[PDB]
Design a protein around this ligand. Structure first.
Ligand SMILES: Nc1nc2c(ncn2[C@@H]2O[C@H](COP(=O)(O)OP(=O)(O)NP(=O)(O)O)[C@@H](O)[C@H]2O)c(=O)[nH]1
Ligand SMILES: Nc1nc2c(ncn2[C@@H]2O[C@H](COP(=O)(O)OP(=O)(O)O)[C@@H](O)[C@H]2O)c(=O)[nH]1
Length: 409
């Protein structure tokens, strides 16, 4: 038998909308992401086990369920790992969610339609977005190869391989498939194993989890004495959490008093840990977890806590209202139909910073070549110095990434 274990890695599936992201995840997992249930946790999210048939031949040997029959064995295949997929379906340019999901990803798949000319505009943007959020274990999937000749396909392979020449993606593998008719889906599973390894985990590190959702899971009609603590859900970036640990939510609760706004950490205990509809006793990185608490539900209702981080109660985690960022910029942003150039940061101009799952707004109080300082509209929990942030500006009525950087403390 295969063990029931949580997902150990997140892989984001992204690409120009309509190019087949949602279908591809379904080909692999057997689940359809928009929408799914339930659950809640939004986005697209789907998990699958991944296994190998030792007797049989690769790629065909790879399997997402515990049977080797397809290669001729009644033998049980070797369990490799459980993985999860996160894809943001539908409307794009809407992503402060690409930034949330950004910090969840241990690697990505960029879906490229084969019956359409490459790069499309949203396809170039996603390729830069990926560099900015610094997720570099990347497989490029050439989808819909079934609608075009081996030849039209190799042509696009040429174009893609060329377009990544000189880039950090120069050696990123390109895998042809049909998500809709399920062709060569095994080559892809092989590639995922080869090109997106579960990262080193250090379990001694201080537990930290980004909150991407919060619910009140009590159904209407629920008797008061049967009520359930608020549920927070999100993904653990480091350390591990255990049922019954004491934890706190940062920045936490927000106070008026009555004209001067501050933030108080929110303290509570972990009542339960769920991955999918599986309960567990611990939560490590990878996958999206649902943490039950002893919190008054009105605290977690309707994603109130979105953007928070969760640490253990006695953890030491600065909450700052001003931050120093060592930053790089892009020379040009894809912009309108034409390439656009980014002005250097100017004093007092307001910016959008994504830290972890937080998207928070700030006014730039100092600017130099490699560093800037911003006054934040809302404080951010900085759980370490390595923390990557994504600077974005207001360009044409819509917020758009102009570069990235490291928060310094
Ligand atoms: N650990 C834990 N997770 C829970 C619990 N109840 C629900 N979850 C998790 O929360 C999600 C399910 O939310 P759901 O039951 O749909 O609540 P809801 O319908 O959104 N709330 P509402 O009806 O108020 O809109 C899943 O991720 C599930 O695993 C619980 O008691 N403990
Ligand atoms: N022929 C063909 N059609 C596909 C393939 N993948 C997706 N589609 C179709 O493309 C349309 C939108 O694809 P979808 O999975 O929703 O991509 P998304 O919008 O990026 O999430 C749907 O009608 C799918 O049936 C494929 O591999 N081959």
């Amino acid at each position: 038998a295969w063990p029931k274990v949580q997902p150990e890695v997140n892989i984001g599936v992204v690409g120009h909308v309509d190019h087949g992201k949602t279908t591809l995840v379904q080909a692999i997992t057997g689940i359809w992401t928009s929408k799914h249930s339930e659950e809640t946790i939004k986005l697209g999210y789907a998990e699958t086990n991944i296994g190998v048939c030792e007797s049989c031949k690769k790629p065909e040997a790879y399997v997402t369920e515990p049977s080797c029959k397809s290669c001729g064995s009644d033998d049980e295949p070797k369990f490799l790992r459980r993985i999860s997929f996160i894809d943001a379906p539908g409307h794009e340019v809407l992503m402060a969610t690409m930034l949330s999901g950004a910090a969840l990803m241990d690697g990505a798949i960029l879906v490229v339609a084969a019956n359409e000319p490459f790069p499309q505009p949203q396809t170039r943007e996603h390729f830069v977005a990926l560099g900015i959020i610094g997720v570099k274990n990347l497989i490029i999937v050439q989808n819909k190869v079934d609608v075009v000749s081996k030849e039209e396909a190799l042509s696009q392979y040429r174009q893609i391989k060329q377009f990544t020449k000189g880039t950090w993606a120069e050696n990123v593998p390109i895998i042809p498939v049909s998500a809709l008719h399920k062709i060569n889906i095994d080559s892809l599973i092989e590639g995922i194993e080869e090109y997106i390894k579960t990262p080193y985990r250090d379990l001694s590190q201080k537990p930290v989890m980004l909150v991407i959702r919060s619910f009140d899971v009590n159904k209407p009609g629920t008797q008061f004495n049967e009520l359930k603590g608020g549920v927070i859900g999100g993904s653990i970036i480091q350390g591990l959490f255990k049922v019954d640990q004491e934890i706190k939510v940062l920045p936490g609760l927000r106070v008026e008093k009555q004209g001067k706004v501050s933030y108080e950490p929110i303290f509570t205990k972990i009542s339960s840990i769920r991955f999918g509809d599986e309960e567990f006793k611990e939560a490590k990185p990878g996958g999206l977890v649902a943490i039950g608490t002893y919190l008054d539900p009105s605290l977690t209702k309707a994603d109130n806590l979105l953007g928070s981080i969760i640490t253990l109660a006695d953890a030491e985690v600065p909450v700052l209202w001003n931050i120093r960022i060592k930053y790089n910029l892009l020379e040009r942003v894809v912009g309108a139909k034409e390439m656009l150039k980014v002005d250097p940061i100017r004093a007092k101009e307001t910016l959008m910073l994504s830290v972890g799952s937080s998207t928070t707004l700030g006014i730039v109080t100092s600017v130099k070549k490699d560093e800037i300082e911003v006054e934040l509209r809302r404080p951010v929990a900085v759980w370490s110095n390595n923390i990557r942030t994504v600077i974005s500006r207001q360009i044409a009525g819509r917020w758009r990434m102009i570069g990235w950087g490291l928060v310094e403390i």
